[model samples]
Target chain A: MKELIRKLTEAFGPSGREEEVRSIILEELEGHIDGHRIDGLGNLIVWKGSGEKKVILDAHIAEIGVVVTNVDDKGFLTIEPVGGVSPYMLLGKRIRFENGTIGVVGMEGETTEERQENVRKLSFDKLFIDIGANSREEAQKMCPIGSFGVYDSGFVEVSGKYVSKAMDDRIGCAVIVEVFKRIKPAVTLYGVFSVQEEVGLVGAGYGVPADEAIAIDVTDSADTPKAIKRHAMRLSGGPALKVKDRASISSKRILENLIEIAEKFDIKYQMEVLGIPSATVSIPTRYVHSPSEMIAPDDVEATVDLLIRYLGA
Target chain B: MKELIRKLTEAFGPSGREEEVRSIILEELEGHIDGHRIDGLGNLIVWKGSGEKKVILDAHIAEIGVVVTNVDDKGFLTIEPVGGVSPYMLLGKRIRFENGTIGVVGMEGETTEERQENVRKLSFDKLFIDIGANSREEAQKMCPIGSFGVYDSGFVEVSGKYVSKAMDDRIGCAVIVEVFKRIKPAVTLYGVFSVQEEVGYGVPADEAIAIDVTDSADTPKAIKRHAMRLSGGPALKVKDRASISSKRILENLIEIAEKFDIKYQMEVLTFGIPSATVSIPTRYVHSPSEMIAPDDVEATVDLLIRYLGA
Candidate 1:
């Protein structure tokens, strides 16, 4: 389970360019699912049967990354963020493009004071990527406009806590894939490997009409330093059940039945009353959307167990 | 223009069933567009090439209506609203389905006092459609569970005010069609006749928009919810619940409208990459009696044409 999770989490997938992560999921579900189809916006939908009630499980497979927009005459590449990627976090970081070319994020400054002022301004205008190309033509050949890149970060497990670059959502994805391997459903089951949640759920919004939809993604953990204890979620605090979000505040029946099932299985869970979803079963991560987000593998396992139990019930 | 507008506004299209509306718009751009394609959500996107930048225009062709969910043995069909439909406004409305079948909205409790009480409690459950089918099998055969229907109202030209069932957005759509015929875009141009905007527009985009109708506050004792008026041209929105207008883009529209002497208004309102909404002013919105001024429509079309030309 950890091996499959590591492979998916380490894969290079940035919003619109989710094919790498998608390929891994398809390979894992080669003979498991009944059938699956990709939508116009690249939503991978898998169904179990043509039963009466429609129950959908959604997990966004896309992560925050950057796209090469312009290449300078000096071979430096100007990039734009595809999702909610932070330059503060990515300065001097390594980025791997889709075509196996790697680049280092650099800035337009010679001295420390110049770079400090530039950082104070904090805009994409001052940032550029160096691919060791000597001219515009050479750099353009490396990565053209619309070429996508993700952080060249690796997956690591430390003291029972798993750390990964794409763990923000690949953790949720691993849960669904695990459930798909051993799932039983009371009604027709549909699993969505949704794309572009980091970019406003462009692929997550549209799909099969269902009586219910559940979003399983990583949520903001309150375990960091100086993090407020109000509406807190711990590192090992099982799956976080969302009570409300900005768009959809889930109903009492959805909460009640899920809680009913959680106690029945003696599973650990937490209440995540934050702003977003139909009903979000979030894996608690200390640094969400960061390159190396942290989460417990046990919470991931618990979410899948709860979902299968809930779906079967 | 009036004839085309009449045909479009009189057309049958609810959220999930926008085929009739899509086919009409598809025919309008038959040979004019360079390329066209429809997405899974039924968004009819037509593009014409010009340059480096891309500008997209959206007008939701789908309007608020109801879908049949269940049918009684007595042939009365129960429906749920596809968009923001008011049972209070549709108590006795006559409806027309896509297959040319006619129906009337009826309610439980035959008495005026009881029916009035039902109206006070107003819900889709209390209301049903009378398709005049004598049997459940016959009614279900005519309009299935997913069948959509709109108001059975004809276009009315009361002076310059044009009242129809779908002027809330068909007016915006009519503007795009007119613009498509006359536009010479400086940059790449694309127009989307989107579906499900009446419910919630799930269609994706950028660098985008929705030319829709805003509620007109020009009537007597209107409570002045918004500072909008009839014949106000197109309202260039500044902000909404979750966003603000892209200042660079907003000022460009303002400058272009100023240079061309086009009339426009200010308003507050969705999301993503430098988005803006150019809304028309419609009175009695989401009802059979929705109305718009021809001057506003003409002004909106002119503004877009001049902006695109620039």
Candidate 2:
């Protein structure tokens, strides 16, 4: 299971460009799913059980990235955000383009004061990507204009917790993928490995209509130092059953259903503030949208257990 | 001439990629400017009159645009704005890519009322560009992912005025290009066809003059504290949010506008250092259809010559 989580999180699938991510997932779900289909927007839909009642389980497989705009004559590339990439978050970061070219992000500052000010508050105009190419022709040979890239960092199990890029939804995908294998649902189950959620929840919203739905994704954990207090969730607090978030709310019926299901199995669970039975079960994640996003492995186990019990029961 | 303004305004140059705009300017100034060079940041700096004192005249050569983020299977492309592209301005608009492929901007709605509400309060999420392509594979051939586009509109003349996309500073570029050709300057002059002011491209000078557009309040009830009026000829900058105008340049510019009888207005709008601005009071600044008086363009050139040629 930890190995699955690692493989899923390490995959490169930035927003609409999620074919590689989808391929890996399909390889994993080889014989586990009863039926599966890929949507027009690249959502991976799979299911089990022939019952009339359907429960939708979605986990967006897309991650944030930067698209190369101009390959400068000196081999530096200019970029714009593909989703919500913060300039400050990308300092000294290495990015890997789809064709396996690596580039390092650097800032435009001459002095201590200029460098300090730029590092303190950075923008794309004052930063560029160096791909170790000496000229435009060389850089363009390896990576052309319109090539999208993500943080070149790899997955690792650090401090007994899982950490990697794309962990935000891949962690959720891992949970749902495991649940699909383990669940012998009395009712129908649809697991949607969706796409383009970082760009605005594009894939899951399309197709995958269901009588009951739960978005299994990662949410911010408030266990870190100086975390935003508006959201009250912690790491290792177990699978979060969200009641309400900025997007939607969970029905009381599903809330009670999740609660009784967790209690019956003696599995740990936590209340989440964001998303709703038209709800979400979030793996509490730390430093989301960063290269080094983290989540407790125990929380992953808890989420997988809760989801399995919820569906299998 | 109005011909120069039309060419400059029609040429494509979105921020950070301004080579095309520079190409046209250099072509116009061929065998004319004493020296010219483009900096690493794509700012085109041309100079004449080798003297001790230098006055910089800058006009941003770039325009606003949308960068393609995702090219969906249906050939519909999703875009995030490269600059501050107001979604409302993009409704039913045609954008041209660098490769000469055109795409129309459309919103996400099913009905007339849904489309109406979306157009009323639009965002990038509700918007996508449709180039004539059957699939992502087809669209990517002409316009790949990360391709940027600007308004596919062209220069048009109406009511003795010039209205076109990117006239905010292209008109300024026109004015300065003429100034360099016409002015037999006493002081050294650097006419900067600067790039990326729409996305904050900074430039230099001593006693600089920013030749750009000012928002016009000539329309109904759209009045503001710093607004200029359309058809009021070129504007002499009094002060703005960026810097107090140099007393010497402001008085000199104002002195020329009146002595030459060029019917100019006083503008109190924005940027640059130790500078006074000469503005063409553009209607719908930053919008696709930016409007300016042709006389104002001529007057701006005349005023620059009088001040710098002195």
Candidate 3:
């Protein structure tokens, strides 16, 4: 599970361009599921059975990244955020384009101190990409306008916890992939590996024909030594049965059923209530949407355990 | 020119999704321009010549629209604005999805009087799309989540002027298309029909000259008295919100316009709309029925032809 999580988190796919991530999952689910197909908006929908109650298991495959907008004369490229990219998080960070070209994020003006003071006012428009090209023509030859890029961060395991870029939803995708491999469900199940959730949850309902849907994603864990007292969720605590989020409230009966399954199997679990429900079942992850997101492998295992029992029972 | 403008304005291609508009322009430039190719950003970069000096003429191809965010139990869809969409413009307006599924924009809550009183405060959050589907299952089949749509309005000419949805940059696009067909320039020219300008100036160029419209000073009780007038021959933007017209380019354009005896206005704007106009004169901008003068558009073409020829 840890190996799979690391591999999934390291794949590249941001918002509109999610083919790479989808390719990885398709390879993994080659013959595990009954049948599957990729939809119009690039959602991977895998089918399991023929039963009365239809269940949709969803986890978005796309991560937040930057799109090259303008390539200047000196080969510096200006970018616009594809999702929610923070300016402070981007500066001096390494980014990898889809085609394997790497670049460093740099600001346009002002000293580091001045920029930190005006961080709120800073935007991607004021930032530029330096790919070490000599001229605009050279840069265009390297990375053209409209190419997608994500944080060039590698996966690393610190003790039992995992850290990597795209941990927010890739970890969720990893959970769904594991659940699909292990579950022997009696009821009809549709596993939807959705796309573009970071950009307004754009792929949530694409060709997903189900009675009710459960999204497996990561919730923000305010568990650091400084912010520990604020959030109820904790790293390595357990899989969370989401109660409510900004976009959705879990179906009461489903939430209760998940809780029951967790108890029945003695799987560690917690009730999650966040501003945004972290999709549905979530691992307690910290610094979500940043280059380096942190999560625990134990929580991932617990989530899969609860899901397998809930579906197979 | 009117036919080209009408065709361009009637096409469907909102920001970040400009395949249709790019197709139309590419087809039109197939045998006319020297060569053309679409960049990764979906900007149609058409080349004319390989002269010593390089000039890039830009006009955005994508217009403002909506992306489907949430589909409810009863087949109603909640949308978030793609660019700068006004609630006033959306209420009761018909929207057509890329797949030809038509939907009507409806606001939630409040009586007509109350809505009218708080129209400015209304947003897409308070708006829902009614596609006449009975359930979420039904709506999902027609317009899937992540589908994009735009105002389903057609081109209509009024008293020698033109009005249509997405006329802001489409008209500018038409101007470039027309110039490409006629101009035999001495300098290397790249005619760029850009995408995502309504969201961000997502295309890059060296010494880029943006072609767009500006507000007409002729509106009733207009706040800024210095705004350009309708049919005031294409306004030569002196200084705009994003940039001060490069003094050399500004002077060269003015001198060319004077030498050619083209009707023109020198525009200097303090407050301006985001992408549609830097300083070029346009009226009723960013609305479904944006108005532009045929003569002024012709004047813009005339000035560009003379400048490029020189």
Candidate 4:
């Protein structure tokens, strides 16, 4: 499961460009699921059972990324954010184009103060990607004008946890994949690898047709010293179940059932009630959407456990 | 110039979708320019006279708009901001697709307070467009995914002032078009109708004289406390978010404006707001119905003509 998580998290997938990630997901679920298919919007729908009652276990496969909007004469690529990209996280960060071309994000202002000011009030307009090309022609040759670039961060395990970019929903995908491998549900279960959730849940809103929906995605751990005290869900505290978020109310019965299953099975767990659900299932990720996101291995395992238990029930 | 301003402002040109605006501009400039060509990036680069010194009289052709990111099962379209669009100004307002399909911007949460709060903190994630379609298929037929929608606004004159959408740089484009018709400077002049300026992207120029709309502090309902006044003539930008005008260029503009006895003011904008070198004072900027004095538009063209010939 951890190896699958690493593979899924390391794949290149941005909001609108989810082909690479969808292909990887299809490869992973080839023989494990009963059947699978890709939808018009590139959603990877894999089903496990033939029961009449169907439930959706959704995890968006798309990650936040930058799209090249303009290339200057000096071969620098100006980018537009495909999701909620913060400038502070982007400056000097490494990004990889679809064809594996690498670039570093840079800003315009000459002075350090001006640059810092630009970052603080950072809109995508002030930032550009430097792919080490000398002129616009060279940059254009390497990565075309409208190509997508995902964060080029390698997956790493820290202590007893995992760290990587695109951990937001890829980890959720990993959980559903593991659940498919481990559970034998009495009812029909749809393991949906959705697309474009970062850009306003575009794929799942249009793709998933289920009697009930449960999304598996990461949330802010808020365990650090500067964490917001109200909803400071902690890493290693276990799988965080969503009671409610801005998008929808998770079935209260399922929330209680997951908590009960976790308690009965001695699987560590936590409850998440965030003002905005960064992710429906709280995996307690920090610096999410940035190149470097940290998550607890134990919490992920516990999430998988809760998912399998719910599916079997 | 006001008539031209009205026509240009009424054109359907949002950022990244400037075909309508470009076509309109091309038709207007017919038999009026020496030469003009659309660049790879869709910039209309027009030349007035052949000379050694090259200067660019520039303004952006794109306006603020919403991009359809998703269409729900119920046909409501989820949008992302193409530029700095104010939700307060968008709510309950009509937006037009390139094909003239209209939609109303709406929010999710109920109650006036919730709706207003959502608007105050509005990002594109919270906003949706209703095009009178009952299903996603119907909405897709009206306006497909990734289509750009601009403000569906009309030209209006209130007293001596003109009001229209996208006045920020449409007014600037108008001034340059007029300047191209009237001025035949000894030096080369490139009347560049640039693209994506609202999104902080611009084409290169040796020395750019941008004719954008600047905010006025003297409006009846002023938002910011700036000293510039409406009908104060065209304002010469000294310092703005993107660039600080070179002292030599600033002085040259001052000299030209003074020589023509044109009424103008120096504009030093607060930080973080993108601006051009010279601006015509406009009220309620970035909102539909941005207000500007008719005389100010003429003053901007007059200033550009004098500066070009100086």
Candidate 4 chain B: 10-residue stretch with minimal lDDT? B196-205
Query: Which residue runs of candidate 3 sit more than 4 Å off their true CA positions?
Result: A1-313, B68-80, B104-138, B197-205, B238-247, B269-280
Tens digit of lDDT per residue, candidate 2, span B32-139? 688888754457899888666778988988788887656777889887665557888888999998878999998999999898888777888899999999997788
Cα lDDT of model 1 by residue, B1-310, tens digit: 7877897898877654677777888788777678888764457888775656777888888787776655678888887675667998778899888889899998899788997788778887888999999987788678754467788887989987899998868888888888887887776778988753321223233447568898888989876555789988788887643334466667778887899999999885433457777888889998899988888888888888887764
Assess candidate 1 and give its lDDT: 0.79
In candidate 2, stretches whose alpha carbon ends up further than 4 angstroms from where it belongs are A1-313, B196-205, B221-227, B240-245, B269-273
DockQ of 2: 0.01
lDDT of model 3 at position B233:
84
**Scoring each candidate complex against the real one, what DockQ results?**
0.02, 0.01, 0.02, 0.01
Q: Give the lDDT of residue A265 in candidate 1.
A: 93
lDDT of 3 at A311: 73
Task: Tell me what TM-score chain A of model 1 achieves.
Answer: 0.92
Candidate 3 local lDDT, B2-105, one digit each (tens): 88888899999876567788888877777778887765435688978666766778888878787765688899988866666777788899998887889999
Candidate 4's TM-score = 0.51
RMSD values for the candidates in order, in angstroms, are 11.1, 16.9, 10.7, 14.7
Model 4, which residues run further than 4 Å from truth? A1-313, B109-126, B196-206, B220-226, B240-245, B269-276
Ranking by TM-score: 3, 1, 4, 2
lDDT comparison, 2 vs 3, better candidate: 2
For residue A204, what is the lDDT in candidate 2? 34
